[PDB]
Amino acid sequence: ITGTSTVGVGRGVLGDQKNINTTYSTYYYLQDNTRGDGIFTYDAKYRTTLPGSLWADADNQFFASYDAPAVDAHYYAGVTYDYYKNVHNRLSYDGNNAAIRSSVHYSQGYNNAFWNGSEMVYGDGDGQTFIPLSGGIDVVAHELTHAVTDYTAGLIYQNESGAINEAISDIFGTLVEFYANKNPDWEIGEDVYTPGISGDSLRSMSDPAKYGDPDHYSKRYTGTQDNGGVHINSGIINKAAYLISQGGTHYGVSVVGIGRDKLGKIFYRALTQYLTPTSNFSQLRAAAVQSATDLYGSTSQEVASVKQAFDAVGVK
Ligand SMILES: [Ca+2]
Ligand SMILES: [Ca+2]
Ligand SMILES: [Ca+2]
Ligand SMILES: [Ca+2]
Ligand SMILES: [Zn+2]
């Protein structure tokens, strides 16, 4: 819509108050003109037709319970845009300030969120397994990172390349959670998963086997479920990324941690310069070693730690 940029106020899924960028033109819409070609949030009104209607509100105050998932999808898309621009000098997911569109209230009792190739889509959850999924900053940033992957490396969504695509979304979802400093951890989806249960999450990067996902290449899933295990075998890469950042000893191999900012620099370079659509885990190891070599030198501690971490999870 064409109108005047302004700022409204609302409450997210977890009850927290935040300011959000809106546009006024008769109604106040969830349209943020301050970031790139804009961030746009739509109401899918419990249907599956997309994108639905651009969110309109009469008074620029978003404190109704129906408003909460829209406030968090719109705010956390802006945080994710700021992480990519400020940390990696990337404007939006295509590198040319493409508009970011999200729809909330998709379907009824839908326990997932996804990037569909054109926009982000969030279900409200069934209220038992999940609460509205845009309430998790690591979920929002995981889905927007699929758009970054699609416009760069183009990893196909099956088998080892699919597991790399999912691990890259959990890696950068976690790095955005630390950037925003929103109670950060190395778990995925803990703010919106099982509201009646404390302490759990969908997946863990620090210990994937807590929920039964593999933490070594010898334990990889080789069947056909889940597109060849794309959400299961991502645990192998997630554990290597956790070891590169934090360090530790895993299956008797010791890794010196180099921290989160270098982890993000190495994997963003690997994703944007060296990975291709059909890259497998061994090629990811080579791309991450070449990226660390480019940035820090072939005899750096950073290169050593990348090698040790892939040796610890059995990826040669
Ligand atoms: Ca209102
Ligand atoms: Ca957290
Ligand atoms: Ca998390
Ligand atoms: Ca829980
Ligand atoms: Zn994903």
Question: Looking at domain 155-315, does it have CATH number 3.40.718.10?
Answer: no
- The structure's method of determination equals X-ray
Selected catalytic residue, list 74, 105, 231, 250: 231
Q: Is 172 left (phi over 0), alpha (psi -120 to 50) or beta?
A: alpha
3-state SS string for 203-216: EECCCHHHHCCCCC
CA dist 4 and 67 (Å) reads 21
The CB density around residue 99, as the number of other CB atoms within 10 Å, is: 15
Rounded to the nearest angstrom, the distance between the alpha carbon of 263 and the centre of ligand 2 is 19
Third-level CATH fold of 6-154: Elastase; domain 1 (3.10.170)
41: which strand partners?
Answer: 102
| Amino acid at position 79, single letter | V
| Amino acid at position 316, single letter | K
DSSP, residue by residue, the chain: ---EEEEEEEE-TTS-EEEEEEEEESEEESEE-SSTT-EEEEE-TTSSSSS-EE-EESSSEE-SGGGHHHHHHHHHHHHHHHHHHHHH---TTTSS---EEEEEEESSS---EEE-SS-EEEE---SSSBS-GGG-HHHHHHHHHHHHHHHTT---SSHHHHHHHHHHHHHHHHHHHHHHTSS--SEESTTTB-TTSSS--SEESS-GGGGT--SSGGG---SSHHHHHTTTTHHHHHHHHHHHHH-EEETTEEE----HHHHHHHHHHIIIII--TT--HHHHHHHHHHHHHHHH-TTSHHHHHHHHHHHHTT--
| Annotated catalytic residue 160 | no
Rounded to the nearest angstrom, the distance between the alpha carbon of 41 and the centre of ligand 1 is 15
Selected catalytic residue, list 74, 105, 143, 250: 143
Residue in this structure with the two tokens 């295990």, named with its chain if needed: 229
Q: Which of 266, 268, 254, 253 is nearest to 302 (CA)?
A: 266
Rounded to the nearest angstrom, the distance between the alpha carbon of 111 and the centre of ligand 5 is 13
CA dist 294 and 283 (Å) reads 16
11: which strand partners?
Answer: 17
Rounded to the nearest angstrom, the distance between the alpha carbon of 102 and the centre of ligand 3 is 20
CA distances to 44, 62, 302 from 56, rounded to whole Å, are 12, 10, 49
CA distances to 81, 153, 246 from 105, rounded to whole Å, are 22, 31, 37
Q: At what angle do helices 260-269 and 234-246 cross, to 10 degrees?
A: 130
Q: Which of 96, 156, 150 is nearest to 119 (CA)?
A: 150
- Which residues are found with C-beta within 5 Å of the ion, ligand 5? 166, 169
- Which residues are found with C-beta within 5 Å of the ion, ligand 3? 138, 177, 185, 187
* 311 assigned binding-site residue: no
Question: Quick one: tokens of 173?
Answer: 């979802």
CA dist 92 and 84 (Å) reads 7
Which residues make Cβ contacts (< 8 Å) with residue 278, sequence separation at least 6?
Answer: 156, 161
Q: Which ligand is nearest to the CA of 192?
A: 4
Kind of pairing between the strands at 4-11 and 61-62: parallel
Rounded to the nearest angstrom, the distance between the alpha carbon of 61 and the centre of ligand 1 is 4
Q: Which of 230, 245, 82, 251 is nearest to 164 (CA)?
A: 230
* 105 assigned binding-site residue: no
* 187 assigned binding-site residue: yes
* 177 assigned binding-site residue: yes
CA distances to 3, 141, 239, 282 from 316, rounded to whole Å, are 55, 29, 15, 6
Q: Where are the domains of the chain?
A: 6-154, 155-315
| Annotated catalytic residue 74 | no
The CB density around residue 148, as the number of other CB atoms within 10 Å, is: 25
Rounded to the nearest angstrom, the distance between the alpha carbon of 14 and the centre of ligand 1 is 18
Kind of pairing between the strands at 56-57 and 39-43: unpaired
* 258 assigned binding-site residue: no
